[PDB]
Design a protein around this nucleic acid. Structure first.
Ligand SMILES: [Mg+2]
Ligand SMILES: [Mg+2]
Lengths: 88, 318, 37, 90, 99
RNA sequence: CCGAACG
RNA sequence: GACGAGCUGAACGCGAAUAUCUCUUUCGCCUUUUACUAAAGAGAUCCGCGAGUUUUGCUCACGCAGUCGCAUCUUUUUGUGGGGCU
């Protein structure tokens, strides 16, 4: 059990951004992240490489093609940082 | 032979509805006028068709005591049942399943009235002297007012902001629910003129008139128009009866405001002409006190429910 | 009225709605089977 | 078996039929799958190769690594698999 | 997973090479394998100035397809999923009269 | 197998 | 994503126990009728029996609870990147 997907699966209802492996940009709300880092987002807009934005009521993104996450500035990190060492 | 002007499509001009096993305390016609919701003392609700068989096609159970009052919901597919087992229940009519059972009252939930324009909201007044307002989609009660004497009859106004409650305290009260978001609001209007308890309350088809049946053996007609004379009392009806039974005897307006029907304890179905304030029909045939009378939504059909486990269902000729 | 009568009037209506819809009084009630002598 | 997801057993029950294989390189492979792996390595026979340039070639047998393969095209006949029907709302 | 909420619901898929796959959802594997019924490949051709981006994306019809997650990048919704009688009697009776 | 009544 | 013993009601149904009766016939007792015999059939009855919620009578018992809205080496979630030709 890694620390960080342990952190990421508690991103439920987080309104965050994502960069893709090929350079697509996505701003939307994390409805779920799972142990494979695959995320299903709500209230989304996806903007492809050199493309116009298109909004999505919901979106699915694979954990592996994720380049990275942009988290809220309003984040209580040290709230979600406790318990990551806790095995359930 | 005798060929007297068949009004309705019913097979006969007088139809008795049997199948109950207890007193029938309140009844109601579907808004589209082809269903009957009959709530008996046997804690059960019969659903009858108004035409072509009068088939009780469903018996819904789920109350543990007498279902004292039934209305239909504005679209006709959901039913509001109120009982003595302290539990009001929302059911789906076509289905036979109960939707939402709220039991917040402490004693017998005598009276209820669901709102006819607006949201899915109904008032219920019970023996605890508290008249409570209930919105459908929240599971808490949205309002709770406290009188001091057990609530017998309650109705929700045509327009949807005030509640009428009348009981053993010799005066019927009109309360404002938006004026009250607090737990000990004081009453807005005090309609006095009944000499003892009120038993039944009906809102007029225009909403300006409220009908009150009283064990003062008197039907009284008041106006609820916020600009009224000092005495809102308009009309008085004599003729029906209340006895030691002290059953929940109700009111009704014909769908046109032309007649007023009362249930009585002398087993008679009374139907006055509102205007002349006098007795149009005095129909016999019931063996127990007549609990509630309901006028069919479209035709002049009157159906009565009695404490004799039957319901007469017939049309008016004159 | 003025609770000089409304007390007992309200209490009598209370006790009568109590007695009328009791568990000994309700519909499906069955009386308990005979006990041994 | 226990642990295994539905679509690979779909692939297995597709055995003995003629299917199509698209790999991540873009060429198409039509042939009779003999049997396949948990890791999607599969063996087709009567192989039609459709290269990136439209090239049509005849191959007797093919063994395809799964992590090389992009998707499979399978007869809707076999989309009547018991998983499909069983999960179905009706 | 919440894509159990998504079986039978029509969906669109992006590949890493940016090819588009539209079909309806049948079964999903842990490896992000998917089962697409009625699938067709929309491959983006380069946009030749003077024509709409929307009117000439090459459609091939693939039929029933299954999708390996390794090159599965993004999934969206495309559309919706495609398409006691009781103990009562009533009898006719006159109303009795007392005289 | 196996006997009682009646007439 | 989750909990019964005893009685009377249920309304539907005949592991291994089986007795009686009626009817239509044959047979045998044989003076007649009962009361019988043993065959064929067709019909009843008795004595009992199983599961559904109806609760009556517990004298038992409960709610941060067992469960909530697979976790880095060639085969899967740690991708082979970068450029550019029609
Ligand atoms: Mg003789
Ligand atoms: Mg003789």
């Amino acid at each position: 059990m890694v620390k960080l997907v342990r952190f990421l699966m508690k991103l439920a209802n987080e309104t965050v951004q994502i960069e893709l492996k090929n350079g697509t940009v996505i701003q939307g709300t994390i409805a779920g992240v799972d142990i494979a880092m695959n995320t299903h987002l709500k209230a989304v807009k996806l903007t492809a490489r050199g493309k116009n934005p298109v909004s999505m009521d919901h979106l699915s993104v694979r954990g592996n093609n994720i380049r990275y996450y942009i988290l809220p500035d309003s984040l209580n990190l040290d709230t979600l940082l406790v318990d990551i060492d806790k095995p359930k | 032979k005798e060929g007297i002007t068949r009004t309705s499509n019913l097979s006969a001009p007088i139809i008795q509805l049997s199948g109950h096993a207890g007193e029938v305390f309140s009844m109601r016609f579907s808004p589209d006028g082809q269903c009957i919701a009959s709530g008996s003392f046997d804690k059960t609700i019969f659903l009858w068709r108004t035409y072509d068989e009068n088939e009780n096609y469903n018996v819904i159970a789920g109350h543990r005591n007498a279902v004292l009052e039934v209305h239909w919901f504005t679209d006709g597919e959901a039913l509001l049942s109120c009982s003595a087992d302290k539990t009001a229940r929302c059911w789906d009519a076509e289905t036979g399943a109960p939707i939402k059972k709220m039991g917040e009252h402490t004693a017998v939930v005598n009276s209820c009235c669901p709102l006819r324009r607006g949201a899915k909201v109904f008032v219920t007044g019970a023996d605890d002297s508290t008249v409570k307002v209930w919105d459908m989609r929240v599971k808490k009660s949205v309002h709770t007012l406290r009188s001091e004497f057990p609530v017998c009859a309650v109705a929700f106004a045509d327009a949807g902001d005030q509640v009428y409650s009348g009981g053993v305290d010799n005066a019927i009260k009109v309360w404002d629910l938006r004026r009250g978001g607090g737990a000990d609001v004081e009453p807005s209007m005090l309609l006095k003129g009944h000499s003892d308890s009120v038993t039944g309350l009906r809102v007029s088809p225009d909403g300006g008139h409220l009908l009150s049946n009283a064990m003062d053996n008197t039907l009284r007609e008041w106006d609820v128009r916020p600009y009224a004379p000092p005495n809102r009392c308009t009309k008085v009806f004599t003729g029906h009866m209340h006895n030691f039974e002290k059953n929940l005897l109700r009111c009704d307006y014909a769908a046109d405001g032309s007649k007023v029907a009362c249930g009585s304890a002398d087993r008679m179905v009374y139907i006055w002409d509102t205007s002349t304030r006098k007795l149009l029909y005095k129909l016999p045939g019931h063996s127990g006190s007549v609990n509630e009378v309901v006028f069919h939504s479209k035709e002049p059909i009157v159906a009565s429910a009695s404490s004799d486990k039957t319901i007469f269902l017939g049309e008016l000729t004159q | 009225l003025q609770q000089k009568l409304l007390e007992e009037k309200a209490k009598k209506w209370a006790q009568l709605n109590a007695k009328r819809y009791g568990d000994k009084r309700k519909f499906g009630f069955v009386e308990a089977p005979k006990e041994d002598m | 078996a226990k642990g295994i997801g539905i679509p690979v057993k779909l692939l297995h029950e597709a055995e003995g039929h003629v299917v199509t294989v698209e790999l991540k390189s873009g060429e198409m492979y039509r042939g009779e799958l003999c049997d396949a792996e948990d890791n999607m390595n599969c063996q087709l026979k009567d192989v039609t190769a459709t290269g990136r340039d439209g090239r049509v070639t005849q191959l007797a047998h093919l063994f395809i690594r799964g992590s090389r393969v992009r998707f499979f095209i399978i007869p809707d006949m076999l989309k009547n698999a018991p998983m499909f029907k069983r999960i179905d709302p009706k | 997973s919440k894509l159990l909420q998504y079986i039978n619901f029509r969906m669109r898929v992006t590949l890493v090479d940016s090819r588009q796959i539209v079909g309806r959802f049948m079964a999903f594997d842990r490896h992000m394998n998917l089962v697409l019924g009625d699938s067709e490949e929309f491959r983006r051709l380069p946009p030749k100035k003077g024509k709409s981006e929307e009117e000439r994306e090459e459609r091939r019809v693939l039929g029933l397809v299954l999708l390996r997650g390794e090159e599965i990048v993004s999934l969206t919704i495309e559309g919706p999923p495609p398409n006691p009688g009781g103990p009562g009697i009533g009898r006719a009776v006159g109303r009795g009269m007392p005289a």
